[PDB]
Structures are given as C-alpha cells and as structure tokens.
Amino acid sequence: PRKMERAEGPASVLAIGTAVPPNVVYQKDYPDFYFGVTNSNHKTELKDKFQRMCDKSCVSKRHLYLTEEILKANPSLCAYWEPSLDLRQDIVVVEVPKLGKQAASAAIKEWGQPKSKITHLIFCTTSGVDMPGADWALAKLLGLRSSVKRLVLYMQGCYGGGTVLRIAKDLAENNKGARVLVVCSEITAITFRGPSDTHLDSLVGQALFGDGASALIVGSDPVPAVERAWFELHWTGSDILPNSDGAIDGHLKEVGLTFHLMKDVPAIISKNIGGILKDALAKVFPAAAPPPPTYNDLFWITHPGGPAILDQVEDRLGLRKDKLASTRAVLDQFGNMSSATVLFIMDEMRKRSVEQQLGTTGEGHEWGLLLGFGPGLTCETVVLRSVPLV
Amino acid sequence: PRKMERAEGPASVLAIGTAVPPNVVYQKDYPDFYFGVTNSNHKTELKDKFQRMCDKSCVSKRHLYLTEEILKANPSLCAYWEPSLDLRQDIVVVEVPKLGKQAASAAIKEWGQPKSKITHLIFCTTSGVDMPGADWALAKLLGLRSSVKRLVLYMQGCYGGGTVLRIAKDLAENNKGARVLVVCSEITAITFRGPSDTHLDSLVGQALFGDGASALIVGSDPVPAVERAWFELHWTGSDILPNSDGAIDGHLKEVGLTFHLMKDVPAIISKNIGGILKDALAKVFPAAAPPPPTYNDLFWITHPGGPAILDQVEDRLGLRKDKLASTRAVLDQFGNMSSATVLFIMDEMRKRSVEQQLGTTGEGHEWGLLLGFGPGLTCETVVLRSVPLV
Numbered sequence: 001p002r003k004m005e006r007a008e009g010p011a012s013v014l015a016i017g018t019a020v021p022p023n024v025v026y027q028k029d030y031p032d033f034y035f036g037v038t039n040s041n042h043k044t045e046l047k048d049k050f051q052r053m054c055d056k057s058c059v060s061k062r063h064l065y066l067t068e069e070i071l072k073a074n075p076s077l078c079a080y081w082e083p084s085l086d087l088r089q090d091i092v093v094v095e096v097p098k099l100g101k102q103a104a105s106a107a108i109k110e111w112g113q114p115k116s117k118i119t120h121l122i123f124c125t126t127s128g129v130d131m132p133g134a135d136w137a138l139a140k141l142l143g144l145r146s147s148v149k150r151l152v153l154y155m156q157g158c159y160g161g162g163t164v165l166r167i168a169k170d171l172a173e174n175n176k177g178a179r180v181l182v183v184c185s186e187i188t189a190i191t192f193r194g195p196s197d198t199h200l201d202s203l204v205g206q207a208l209f210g211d212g213a214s215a216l217i218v219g220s221d222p223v224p225a226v227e228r229a230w231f232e233l234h235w236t237g238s239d240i241l242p243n244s245d246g247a248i249d250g251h252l253k254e255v256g257l258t259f260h261l262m263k264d265v266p267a268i269i270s271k272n273i274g275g276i277l278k279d280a281l282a283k284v285f286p287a288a289a290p291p292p293p294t295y296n297d298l299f300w301i302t303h304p305g306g307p308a309i310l311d312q313v314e315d316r317l318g319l320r321k322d323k324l325a326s327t328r329a330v331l332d333q334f335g336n337m338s339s340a341t342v343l344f345i346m347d348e349m350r351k352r353s354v355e356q357q358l359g360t361t362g363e364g365h366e367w368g369l370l371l372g373f374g375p376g377l378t379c380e381t382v383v384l385r386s387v388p389l390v
Numbered sequence: 391p392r393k394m395e396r397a398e399g400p401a402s403v404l405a406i407g408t409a410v411p412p413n414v415v416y417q418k419d420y421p422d423f424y425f426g427v428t429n430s431n432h433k434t435e436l437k438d439k440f441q442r443m444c445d446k447s448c449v450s451k452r453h454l455y456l457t458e459e460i461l462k463a464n465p466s467l468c469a470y471w472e473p474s475l476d477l478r479q480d481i482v483v484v485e486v487p488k489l490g491k492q493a494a495s496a497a498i499k500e501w502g503q504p505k506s507k508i509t510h511l512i513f514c515t516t517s518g519v520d521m522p523g524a525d526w527a528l529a530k531l532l533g534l535r536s537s538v539k540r541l542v543l544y545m546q547g548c549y550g551g552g553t554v555l556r557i558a559k560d561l562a563e564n565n566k567g568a569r570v571l572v573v574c575s576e577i578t579a580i581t582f583r584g585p586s587d588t589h590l591d592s593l594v595g596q597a598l599f600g601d602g603a604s605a606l607i608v609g610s611d612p613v614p615a616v617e618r619a620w621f622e623l624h625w626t627g628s629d630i631l632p633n634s635d636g637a638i639d640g641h642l643k644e645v646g647l648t649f650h651l652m653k654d655v656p657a658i659i660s661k662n663i664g665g666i667l668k669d670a671l672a673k674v675f676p677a678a679a680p681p682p683p684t685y686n687d688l689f690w691i692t693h694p695g696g697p698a699i700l701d702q703v704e705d706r707l708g709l710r711k712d713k714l715a716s717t718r719a720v721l722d723q724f725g726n727m728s729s730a731t732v733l734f735i736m737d738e739m740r741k742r743s744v745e746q747q748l749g750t751t752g753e754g755h756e757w758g759l760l761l762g763f764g765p766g767l768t769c770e771t772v773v774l775r776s777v778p779l780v
C-alpha cells in the first residue's frame with residue numbers, strides 16, 4: 001500500500017512537438033556567409049577546408065537563432081577567441097526556454113489535456129546555465145502548476161535525447177497518473193565563434209550544428225480513446241565506450257562553450273555499437289521465446305552526430321540502406337541539433353508512417369532503437385516499441 | 391512481463407559517507423581573515439557589518455578548499471569583480487568530483503558490497519560545469535562499471551539534496567536490483583569573491599557557505615542480514631513558493647558564480663511551509679486510518695539556509711526547540727554546504743540515534759521530513775520513514 005501509487009503499463013510517448021528559429025541558413029550559402037561575417041575570407045585555405053566539410057555534411061539547411069544582424073551587432077561572437085560568455089548566456093538563458101515553450105505548446109495542444117495535468121518536467125540543454133534554471137523559466141512561460149516536479153539537465157551534449165527518456169521512463173512508470181513534459185532545447189549562440197586553423201574540430205561544429213527544440217508528453221497507462229500512445233519505452237542502457245577518453249569534450253569558458261572533437265569518434269562508435277545493441281536485444285528478448293528481430297526489422301532513431309558516424313555504423317552493422325532514412329532526413333533539414341535531434345527524428349518517423357499508411361508508428365516495424373552519442377564517449381540506448389496504426 | 395523488472399519495497403538509504411576539505415576556518419577568525427586576504431580592511435563600516443553577520447551566523451567553523459596560500463597565489467579570486475571563471479572552473483571541475491569520491495568511497499565501504507553492484511549514479515553540484523561532467527569524472531575515479539547509468543544535476547543550488555532523493559526514489563523503485571550512488575559535492579571556490587558595499591547579499595554568502603560532499607547508496611529491497619536500511623523514501627513534493635520570483639538567484643558569469651539573496655527569504659519560506667507540510671502529511675496519511683503525527687513527533691532534516699530561516703520556520707510551525715537540533719549541529723560545524731547539507735544532517739541524526747540508543751534512526755520517531763530550499767523559490771519535500779534500532 002504505497003504512499004505513492006505507481007503505474008502499470010510501459011511509459012509511452014503521447015505527443016511530440018517541435019520548434020525551430022525562423023532564420024533558415026542554406027548550407028550551399030554557409031561558407032560564404034560564415035567566413036564573411038567572421039572577417040576571415042582572406043584565410044582561403046581554411047575556407048576551402050570548411051567548404052569541403054559543408055560539401056560532405058549531408059546538411060541542406062539549418063535554422064539558426066543567430067542572424068547576420070545579431071552577429072554584426074555583437075562583434076565579440078564573430079571573433080574566434082574573445083570574451084563572450086556573459087553575452088552568450090544573456091541570449092540563451094532567455095531563448096532556450098522560449099524555443100522550448102513553443103515546442104511544448106505544440107505537444108500539449110496535440111495531447112489534448114489541460115496543461116495542469118503535467119506533473120513532472122525534464123528540461124535538457126547544452127546551451128547555457130542559470131539559477132533558477134531553464135526548467136523553471138519554461139514552467140513560468142507555460143503557466144504549469146506550481147508543484148510540478150522539475151529537473152534541469154545542463155551541459156549534457158548529444159546523448160541527452162536518450163538520457164531524458166531514460167529518466168522519464170522511471171518518473172512515468174513509478175508515479176500513477178504522472179504526465180512528464182520532456183523538453184530538449186538547443187541554440188548555437190553558446191558555441192558560435194570565428195574560425196582558426198589550430199582548432200579544426202570547432203570548424204566541424206560550425207558545419208553541422210543547428211538550433212531546435214522538441215517536446216514530448218510521456219506517461220504510463222494512456223486513457224483509452226482519450227490519450228494516444230505513439231511509442232513505448234521498454235529498455236534503457238548507458239555505456240562509456242572503450243578507449244574513448246577525451247573523444248568529445250566541451251568546456252564552458254569565458255569565451256563561451258568550447259568544442260573538442262577527435263577524428264576517431266566514428267570509428268569508436270561504429271566499432272563498438274554492435275556489441276552494445278546485441279547485448280541490449282538479448283536482455284529484451286531472452287531465451288529460456290522469440291529471438292531478437294534482425295536489425296533490418298527494427299526501426300532506427302539514431303543521433304546523426306555526423307554523416308561519417310551514420311555511414312560507419314550503417315556499414316559495420318550491415319544495415320539496409322533505408323534504415324537510417326528518417327535519421328538522415330532530419331540531419332539534412334536541421335543539421336545536428338544536439339540533444340533535441342532524436343526527438344525530431346521520432347516525430348519525423350511517426351509522421352511519415354501515418355502519411356504513407358504504414359502498419360505502425362515505427363515505419364511498419366514493431367521494435368526499434370533510439371541511440372544518442374556524446375561526451376564520454378557516452379552511448380545511450382533505448383529499446384522502443386511502436387504502436388499499430390488504424 | 392516487463393522488459394525491465396521493477397522493485398517492490400520503498401527506496402531505502404543503505405549507507406552515507408561524508409567528506410570535507412582539511413582546511414578548517416573558525417568563524418571567530420573569519421572576518422579578520424577575509425577582509426585581510428581581500429585587502430579590504432580599510433572598509434571599516436563594511437567589515438563591521440560583516441562581523442555582525444558572522445557573530446550571528448550560528449556557524450562556528452567551516453571547511454574550505456580555499457586556503458590563504460591559494461588565494462595569495464590567485465589574486466583574481468580576492469578582488470570583487472574580476473574575470474575569474476576559467477580559473478574557478480579549472481579548480482572545481484577537478485576538486486568537486488575528487489571531494490565527492492572521498493564521500494563515495496566511505497559510503498561504499500559502509501555498505502559493504504563491491505562497487506560493481508552500483509547500477510546508477512546521480513551527481514549533484516552547484517560548483518562548476520563540464521563535458522564530460524562531474525558524474526563521469528566520479529565514475530572514472532571510482533572505477534564504476536562502464537555501463538553505470540549516470541545523471542549530472544548542475545547549477546541546482548540549495549534544494550539539490552531534496553531533488554536527488556526525489557529522483558533516486560524512482561530509479562531505485564522502478565529497477566529491480568538497482569543500487570544508486572547519490573553524491574552532492576559543493577566547493578565555494580566557484581563563488582568566493584572580495585566584499586563590496588553595493589552587494590551585501592553576497593556578503594551573506596561569505597558568512598554562511600562551506601564546502602562538503604555527501605554520498606548515499608539508495609536501493610529498494612535490501613538483502614536481509616546483508617544490507618541495512620537507515621531511512622525509507624515514501625513521498626516527494628516540489629513547490630515554487632508564492633510571490634518568491636527572484637528571491638534566490640545565481641548566474642554563472644565570467645567573474646564566476648554570482649549570488650543574489652532577498653531579505654524576505656525567511657519570511658517567504660516560514661509563512662508558506664506549514665501549508666506545504668500539512669498537504670504532504672494529508673497525502674501520506676489520508677482519512678477514508680491513522681492521523682498524521684504532530685510536527686513534534688516527526689524527525690526533522692531541514693536545509694539550514696541560515697539561522698533566520700530555521701528560527702522563523704520553528705516559530706511559525708510551533709516546533710519544540712529540540713526538533714531542529716541535528717539540523718543546527720551541522721550548520722554550526724560545517725556551514726551551509728548547499729545541496730550536500732541535508733545529507734550531513736541525515737548522517738548526523740542516524741549517528742546520534744545509534745550513539746544514544748534511541749529506538750529508531752530518526753531520534754526515536756517513526757516518520758520525518760527532509761526539506762530543501764533554493765532558487766525558485768523552490769521547496770523540496772521528502773517524507774521519510776526511519777528504521778528501528780536493535
């Protein structure tokens with residue numbers, strides 16, 4: 001007879017909303033723009049290198065808070081190593097919760113229930129820190145009840161989409177009637193800086209990173225015919241990959257957030273992911289019983305840290321060429337939105353499945369994988385179940 | 391049949407370790423020390439106001455990472471408003487997880503099981519941010535399994551001790567066999583700065599804030615005659631207090647972490663806490679059945695934001711004067727250690743109960759309250775149950 005009753009069924013995604021800044025930057029135009037606005041067009045070697053990163057980035061466009069106008073008004077962001085944290089913070093402490101509020105309103109509207117049924121909130125970002133935090137600012141913007149149980153996950157990085165689901169699963173499953181608002185909001189004004197020929201990992205981030213926020217309603221036991229489940233969370237795992245110490249570092253310095261990235265990240269991920277997944281699926285489908293579905297029969301929501309990561313994972317695991325299609329669509333249209341990205345991909349996948357009348361929310365497959373990769377090198381693994389359609 | 395099995399009994403504290411820097415700073419000595427090492431002794435009126443805050447702080451001693459030698463070596467910490475974040479970060483990014491490791495090892499030794507049985511980690515701090523985070527640095531220092539499920543709660547503030555329990559409860563209860571390492575580690579090198587007569591709320595921080603780390607092993611279903619429970623978590627609540635907007639703010643700026651404290655913080659807390667506790671207790675002990683214990687028959691683990699908070703809460707709720715004794719002993723010998731403090735108090739309470747042979751780990755009372763207060767103004771409430779002794 002618990003003092004807090006728990007729930008029975010699996011934690012379920014009941015709604016997804018997304019939001020991007022309205023300023024669209026087409027990748028074809030970005031090297032000219034990026035090197036002009038940072039007064040670096042004379043470094044023609046650096047620029048050619050940046051052109052080829054952009055050429056191969058498999059990003060067609062990104063949505064960016066930073067405009068030409070904001071940049072020319074704030075010269076310290078356009079240089080490479082100028083003190084700038086205070087200005088960066090003044091921006092993202094406001095704009096990260098605001099972008100997340102746009103995404104949350106769309107999730108709440110789809111869900112169909114008054115916002116006061118939201119009992120828990122998880123706010124995740126890599127863009128700025130403050131007290132009270134982005135979670136508090138978001139609850140204020142939305143008018144959530146004063147007793148919402150909040151949690152702010154700061155300085156996470158690109159694995160954070162997996163992390164928020166790992167935690168939300170337990171909040172929803174162990175609290176009867178709990179409805180968890182889950183927000184990932186990322187804005188690149190925290191990292192944007194000029195180019196330097198000695199910091200070529202930061203140049204990569206300028207080719208790939210973009211802005212966005214996504215929002216879920218996560219809860220167990222959806223009310224039949226009133227609430228709608230779209231995916232279920234069944235198994236989570238977290239791994240620090242071997243021999244990955246310092247593969248991806250990020251430091252919050254007086255020049256803003258600095259990004260450090262080793263060239264063997266794709267090899268480290270692609271060469272270890274198979275064991276991680278094979279173990280995950282063995283836990284979920286033990287013999288004592290159906291064997292795990294094959295990789296080609298699972299749906300795939302993979303953090304697209306970069307095209308080389310996706311290509312090398314696809315190659316090492318022998319995935320048919322269409323398995324990463326939803327993943328690659330989101331990267332093409334929004335770039336790498338750090339922790340938010342996987343949820344755009346989740347939303348992209350379910351929307352396509354409805355549109356093309358596939359049999360389930362997961363492109364017609366029953367089971368699936370959501371993977372996030374970030375500093376650690378940390379790999380978050382969430383085994384998902386789709387929900388049948390019509 | 392769940393793909394991840396859950397646990398049955400209440401999340402229980404199975405061990406507690408604590409760790410403080412070796413440098414002890416007697417409050418009698420502190421005004422002379424602080425104004426001397428910050429070259430402010432000419433500020434006669436400022437210093438006397440600071441003497442009065444110390445005289446009254448009900449803090450006798452604090453443990454501090456910063457020493458006179460370190461301060462004289464790094465003059466930007468002794469000025470009031472100098473660029474210093476990179477220096478501070480370089481310190482606490484290392485020292486915060488290092489201090490958390492001493493407390494963790496002590497908790498693990500007490501618990502008695504091999505460190506590899508730790509499945510989950512929650513690291514809470516208000517001092518510094520990094521990627522990978524302090525959670526990852528701690529796991530590395532300890533040699534935890536590569537698949538430990540980690541969470542870093544950055545920039546929490548003084549309510550963090552309640553927040554970690556609220557989260558560890560669900561991690562422990564929803565995952566069969568899960569053992570959660572909970573660490574709160576706080577080091578004032580991130581905020582320490584010289585005095586100024588235009589920023590006197592920050593002066594208050596100089597009178598009250600100390601350094602410390604505490605660590606818990608939290609798990610459901612302790613193995614009988616093998617593991618030992620000291621407190622059980624049964625009910626959690628979180629609240630933004632009314633008309634408290636901006637009462638407690640902190641920003642990570644290029645001069646380091648900055649502290650803003652309104653003078654009505656004790657009024658805000660003491661005038662609203664009764665309704666919060668009455669609501670909580672009504673939820674835990676509903677009529678439909680025993681009534682809730684009186685405040686005086688509860689044990690009290692209260693974050694000592696300062697003596698005026700404790701005194702006004704004690705006055706508003708009509709608490710017998712012995713109720714906040716364990717709480718006040720920790721403030722006296724350690725200061726306000728932000729998120730770590732309530733766990734020192736919890737450690738103090740169980741150690742006294744055992745030493746004096748009371749009937750339970752909660753000073754002879756069955757039920758109790760842990761409260762944390764911080765930015766928001768956020769109130770975290772955890773209804774605890776004690777365990778009977780011998």
Ligand SMILES: CC(C)(COP(=O)(O)OP(=O)(O)OC[C@H]1O[C@@H](n2cnc3c(N)ncnc32)[C@H](O)[C@@H]1OP(=O)(O)O)[C@@H](O)C(=O)NCCC(=O)NCCS
Pocket residue numbers: 049052053056057158200201204248261262263265266305306307308309373374
């Ligand atoms: C876009 C790159 C980004 C794709 O391009 P590619 O297929 O490697 O194309 P190329 O091999 O021509 O590489 C182009 C340039 O990128 C540079 N580059 C790639 N990765 C780099 C890194 N981590 N640091 C510095 N420079 C790098 C290369 O040195 C090369 O320069 P060069 O033309 O002067 O040799 C690709 O390497 C990738 O997808 N990387 C993954 C991103 C990642 O590391 N993790 C994301 C984490 S959250």
Ligand SMILES: CC(C)(COP(=O)(O)OP(=O)(O)OC[C@H]1O[C@@H](n2cnc3c(N)ncnc32)[C@H](O)[C@@H]1OP(=O)(O)O)[C@@H](O)C(=O)NCCC(=O)NCCS
Pocket residue numbers: 439442443446447548590591592594638651652653655656695696697698699764
């Ligand atoms: C130690 C102070 C810290 C206790 O002192 P006190 O008993 O109120 O003593 P006094 O009222 O004489 O105050 C002493 C001085 O502190 C000053 N002071 C107290 N709180 C202050 C604040 N938040 N900002 C600025 N000054 C403050 C008073 O104005 C007074 O100055 P004066 O002597 O020049 O008039 C007390 O106000 C307290 O405990 N407050 C709680 C601190 C807090 O907010 N903690 C929760 C935290 S994040």
Ligand SMILES: O=C1C[C@@H](c2ccccc2)Oc2cc(O)cc(O)c21
Pocket residue numbers: 126127156157158159186187188189190191205209210211248249250251257258259260336337338373374375521
């Ligand atoms: O350098 C930062 C940038 C940040 C981001 C991306 C997009 C939008 C806003 C912020 O994402 C990261 C993820 C990492 O795993 C490591 C990082 O060092 C970063």
Ligand SMILES: O=C1C[C@@H](c2ccccc2)Oc2cc(O)cc(O)c21
Pocket residue numbers: 131516517546547548549576577578579580581595599600601638639640641647648649650726727728763764765
């Ligand atoms: O300014 C910081 C200081 C930090 C701390 C305290 C002790 C040791 C290390 C760090 O605690 C805080 C708590 C708050 O509720 C608000 C704050 O602004 C702070």
